[PDB]
Amino acid sequence: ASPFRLASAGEISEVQGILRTAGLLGPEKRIAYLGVLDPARGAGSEAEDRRFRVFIHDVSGARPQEVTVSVTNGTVISAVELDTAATGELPVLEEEFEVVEQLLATDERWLKALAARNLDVSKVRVAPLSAGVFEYAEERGRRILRGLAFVQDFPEDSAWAHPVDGLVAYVDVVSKEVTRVIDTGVFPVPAEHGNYTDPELTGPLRTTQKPISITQPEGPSFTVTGGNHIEWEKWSLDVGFDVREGVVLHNIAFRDGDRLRPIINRASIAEMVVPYGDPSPIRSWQNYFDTGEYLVGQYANSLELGCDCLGDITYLSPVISDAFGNPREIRNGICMHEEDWGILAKHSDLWSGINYTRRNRRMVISFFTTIGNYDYGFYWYLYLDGTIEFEAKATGVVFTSAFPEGGSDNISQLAPGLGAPFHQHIFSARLDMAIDGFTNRVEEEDVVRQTMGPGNERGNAFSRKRTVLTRESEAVREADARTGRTWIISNPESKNRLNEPVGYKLHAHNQPTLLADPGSSIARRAAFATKDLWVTRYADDERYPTGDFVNQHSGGAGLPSYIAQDRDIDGQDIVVWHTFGLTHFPRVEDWPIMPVDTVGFKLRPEGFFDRSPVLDVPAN
Amino acid sequence: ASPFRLASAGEISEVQGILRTAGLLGPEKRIAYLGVLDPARGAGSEAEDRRFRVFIHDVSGARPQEVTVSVTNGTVISAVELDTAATGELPVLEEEFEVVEQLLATDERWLKALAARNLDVSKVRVAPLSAGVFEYAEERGRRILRGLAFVQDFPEDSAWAHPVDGLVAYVDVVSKEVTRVIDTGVFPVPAEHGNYTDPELTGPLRTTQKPISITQPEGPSFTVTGGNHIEWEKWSLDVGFDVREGVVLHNIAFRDGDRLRPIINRASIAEMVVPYGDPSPIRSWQNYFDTGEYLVGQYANSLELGCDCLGDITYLSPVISDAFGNPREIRNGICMHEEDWGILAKHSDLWSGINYTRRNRRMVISFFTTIGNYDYGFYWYLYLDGTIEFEAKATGVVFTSAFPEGGSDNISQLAPGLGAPFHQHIFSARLDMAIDGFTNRVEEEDVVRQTMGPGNERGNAFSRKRTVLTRESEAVREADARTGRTWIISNPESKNRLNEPVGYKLHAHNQPTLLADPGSSIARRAAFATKDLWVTRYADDERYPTGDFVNQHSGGAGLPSYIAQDRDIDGQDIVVWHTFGLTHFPRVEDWPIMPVDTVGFKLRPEGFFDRSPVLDVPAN
Ligand SMILES: [Cu+2]
Ligand SMILES: [Cu+2]
Ligand code: NA
Ligand code: NA
């Protein structure tokens, strides 16, 4: 019955059917994006209308369409031709990824470049990379991918060990033409292999790890109903999945006594970008919007038991559309389990004689995706004490280059002749807040130091201040770790028993934001990434901090355009957009396969509850 | 055989015997501190000399002594009378904690204060609190504790719910006299109870938690030999214990191929302070040095199985001295176990067809201590990938006050009439570095932004810079989260296969440091807490950032005096002292018992290894 249920195979084949019947999905058409729309505000009263949004590409060069379909009613709600030079190209299609290599393999300029380096074309892999927007006027309105080359010595070789520097090509994937081949000069192709399953490199595998067995003999403490509704230790939510955003949480609420108290209406990673900091023209255009350009959901791994996810695991297998509108299941694409999280609370009291210890736990909802060389785990955590956390785990193989003779200010050395260009991985979490309902506001809280003097004669006092962000023009905020800056989302109309507005405090990690010059193409396309915290007034069409169409799309859309509306956010339906990232100067230890590194954020109750919400947790 | 073995009961009784035989431990003497000394530098060549350091208090008012004993040789190495007005009072004795309440109970000023509030003296608990150094000239050279009152309605009541504000007393615990009773006026004593095991407050306990069972059917992957030598997954260390510092790690090294490579010679929490930010004269003197004044090791909890520590646990039961020099075991005072830590590394490669996943693990070494209302867990973690981490878990019951009518800039409200003064918990980790041996140096690393222009035409470049800290005068550093500031400890004489000095990078959390005015008593006594990172040249007598005697000791000793020596730290035997803390504005959710909050730091290999050190970890 839930309007937040996952898309079923049936619904996708029905969208396919409706589009076909309507003349919108002939044999030259391809689905570049398809997802279910969230129900409108206040729609609980009305009967279900399951609506799907679809971006349709045309392989014959006709203009693509944005289409909204009602699968409940079997109708097309709206269909509009896109002008991609204006609003952006559609997301990269899975089927286009082979096309860069295939076209380049019979291009005389490419072949000349490979022959200058004595490289067998049959062994040269070409990464199909998003193009961005730079100085090339001919690319505007065209679907372009850029290709960087990596040699693969044999079928099972890791090509990433053998970058071909000094060489880049640009390809029109629709007309199937190579527009440019740039050769700046030969660099040595690093020779050492990076095959992390080859016994010659690993040495003898360790025999010293004894098993760890995690079991739940009575099964898990959470329930799943309606396919994707979770109830666990007072928490209630719906686990959604979208091909762009991946796992999306809906209706996060906490049962406090008899009352189901909303906290967050929708939580997602609404964008992620990987900007590169190497000024070589071979890579200075590289910025991968894994979410917006590639669609991280669509590359979600099938997660194997006792391996990717350990313990008593419950899986969801979300269904997505292939390029023709046929349903495709991602088997075991979402893991759900609970795990012990050490001590929750502890006190041994001298005066009472009472010793008290209680254990913490968290609910984990995750998926893992692979985008070329990169693999990312996305983890959401709900804790007994009302804390909500996100963590991204970054691993895979580092993107490589040659290491220049005489070194580099922008590239580190991994192996002899092998470089790793500096880069960042920067996420935007979109938190459609609903602290005890939709009437919310945000305050910025700083620690306040006090001067020794009258009222503070020992010079020990310290305090804090809160500033309400009243309108969107005042709601673009930066971190200040030194002053302990956080942001509190409260409901000014819902008060706890001490007559204070209930709230939640967002604790950031205060990692560096986007480093690029503010006049760069990336600073404009990823404007969101230049500031730690944005607050907008909710609107149904403000979904992504980069807009709907990121691929080859200049600035114009996304957060900077949303906030220009300068709308009231003081006790209104609001959305918090938190930027957070990792700044990576690759180390030798990252090669040949990267150990996980992490980044994230959390929100903790701040006068939301009338006392600790975990007094009723049992011993042992 | 190891000179780093834990103290045995035998050794302590022998210290007792040697002191007695030497005339230093008659019936008026009391041991305020006793611990084993680390072996001297280069002492591996010589035979063992187990030496113990002892601070001896005298209950008849004679001057205390600092004594060093050789238990191997049965001799007193040195004994010196302390002048406590100059160098500091000895640590608070366990036996003095009852004395504040007991003396106050027959003092006419105290009784008058309690009668003004209609409080039965038999129900008034008095916390025995360190005094610090303020404006009271009569306290210099005297052992003083200050008392704050809390009402306990019945034997099992939590007194913390019922603070008696407006009232403080000062007591000389040697002469057994009350020096001062200050009554600033009556405040309502908060009436609501805070009994977190009372069913009326907890409600019916949850029945929704199903078991989680963690077992190791082949036992743990680590070995313990010589009582306290750990070997686990290439790591090697000795787990020490000291009554002041608690758990201390020695000789942290990693077996890389056939070579045992030192990383850290000694790691400890060398101080921790809890400064309060309420300017009321009732509490404006409150700063608890839990390590330096109280000795956190001595209050280590006995940890119960499946409860404080879950899984397959190996315990150490360290032995300490009681006040008379008799050994006392802290049964199950140290937990050691390994645990799964999610994904270590993962890549699914399109070109090779190879899917690869490996799991992480960490070795955990911990203890938990209780100091009045506070309980802290100290956790050290060693990871497969060479990462070393510390985490402090703060819980217990918040220190309370009245909540003033009309509110407060320095106190939050927890319950009706019940306040919680703002405060910090600030730790100093002392890391006696030995990166591939003792010849080490520290660089401060910042991210460097670059301007769009020649050499960077797309404005995408970014870089980093490193500054060597060459002498102690340049080695007092602050955090800069915005520039991604870290500190690298390297060995300039030990190079990896890429000809770069091997190293480790310290990643701080960049939480606020000490907030107090720089002219305060606490800023001087806890000078270490005003800066994030200090580097000193190693000396055997520079143990604590606050000096040896913190109790009622002004500035004069500790880090600021150490660095004045302005010694060479550029390729020398050095010590890093990292300040890190929590700034706590208590929330309603912290009451009546606080859910755990955390703070910490970590160090990760930075070109230490020639490639990933976890290539030899097996699948599944
Ligand atoms: Cu990276
Ligand atoms: Cu606290
Ligand atoms: Na909202
Ligand atoms: Na050292």
**Of A410, A520, A510, A525, nearest to B462 (Cα)?**
A410
Measured between alpha carbons, how far is B73 from B18 in angstroms, rounded to an integer?
A: 10
Q: From B347, which residue of chain A is nearest by alpha-carbon distance?
A: A396
Q: Does A512 touch chain B (CB under 8 A)?
A: yes
CB A158 within 8 A of CB A400: no
| B169/B184 Cα distance (integer angstroms) | 12
Which DSSP state fits A498?
Answer: T
- Two tokens at A196? 């992390």
Interface test with chain A among B299, B304, B589, by most A beta carbons within 10 Å: B589
**Strand-strand pairing, B213-215 and B223-225:** unpaired
Q: Are A492 and A439 in contact (CB under 8 A)?
A: yes
Q: From CA B319, how far away is CA B6, in angstroms rounded?
A: 8
Bridge partners, residue A84, by sequence: none
Q: Extract long-range pairs of A233-239: CB within 8 Å, 24+ residues apart.
A: A233/A361, A233/A363, A233/A382, A233/A384, A233/B206, A233/B208, A233/B209, A234/A613, A235/A363, A235/A382, A236/A260, A237/A382, A238/A2, A238/A4, A238/A5, A239/A6, A239/A316, A239/A334, A239/A336, A239/A365
Within 114-173 of B, beta carbons closer than 8 Å to A belong to: 125, 134, 150, 152, 155-159
Token reading at B33? 């501190």
Q: Specify the 3-state DSSP secondary structure of A593.
A: coil
Tell me which residue of A147, A178, A171, A143 sits closest to A552, measured CA to CA: A143
In the three-class reduction of DSSP (H, G, I as helix; E, B as strand; rest coil), residue A496 is classed as: coil
Token pair of A432, please?
């459609």
Q: Is A425 annotated as a binding residue?
A: yes
- List all residues 6 or more positions away from B554 whose beta carbon is below 8 Å from its beta carbon: B133, B521, B524, B525
Q: Could you list the beta-strand ranges (E) of B257-289.
A: 259-275, 287-289
Helix (H, G, I), strand (E, B) or coil at A599: strand
Give B-chain residues touching A209 at CB under 8 angstroms: 221, 233, 361, 617-618
Residues of chain A with CATH 2.70.98.20: 196-619
Expt. technique: X-ray
CATH class as words, domain A1-87: alpha beta
Closest by Cβ to B512, choosing from A207, A484, A619: A484
Cβ of A479 and B482 within 8 Å? Answer: yes
Q: Within 13 Å, how many C-alpha atoms sit on residue B595's CB side?
A: 23
Task: Give me A109's structure tokens.
Answer: 């300029």
At A433 the three-state DSSP class reads strand
> DSSP strand E in A217-305: where?
223-225, 229-232, 235-242, 246-256, 259-275, 287-289
DSSP state of A292: I
Give, in order, the Cα–Cα distances in Å from A606 to each of A92, A487, B220, B582, B598: 42, 11, 40, 16, 16
Residue B259 structure tokens: 């070579």
d(CA B447, CA B462): 7
Q: Which residues pair with B503 in a beta bridge?
A: B490
Contacts of A179 (CB under 8 A, 6+ apart): A136, A138, A139, A144, A170, A171, A172
Gap between the Cα atoms of B463 and A296, Å rounded: 28
Chain A CB contacts of B208 below 8 Å: 221, 233
Domain A196-619 belongs to what architecture? Distorted Sandwich (2.70)
The residue among B123, B146, B347, B408 with the most chain A CBs within 10 A of its CB, best to mutate, is B347
Q: Report resolution in angstroms.
A: 1.8
The structural architecture, per CATH, of the domain B94-195 is Roll (3.10)
- Which residues make Cβ contacts (< 8 Å) with residue A294, sequence separation at least 6? A91, A92, A130, A288, A371
Q: Which residues pair with B183 in a beta bridge?
A: B167
Antiparallel, parallel or unpaired: β A388-396 and A374-383: antiparallel
Q: Quote the tokens at residue B156.
A: 């099992």
Query: Could you tell me where in chain A the CATH 3.10.450.40 domains are found?
Result: 1-87, 94-195
- A590 CB within 8 Å of a chain B CB: yes
**Angstrom distance (rounded) from CA B440 to CA B432:** 10
Which residues of B fall within a CB distance of 8 Å from A481? 479, 481-482, 510-512
Amino acid at B351: W
Collapse the DSSP code of B586 into the 3-class scheme (helix H, G, I; strand E, B; otherwise coil) and give the result: coil
Query: How far is Cα A515 from Cα B447, in angstroms, rounded to an integer?
Result: 9
Q: How far is the CA of B398 from the centre of ligand 2 (A)?
A: 6
Residues with CB under 5 A from ligand 2 (ion): B 584
A30 alpha-carbon distance from chain centroid:
24
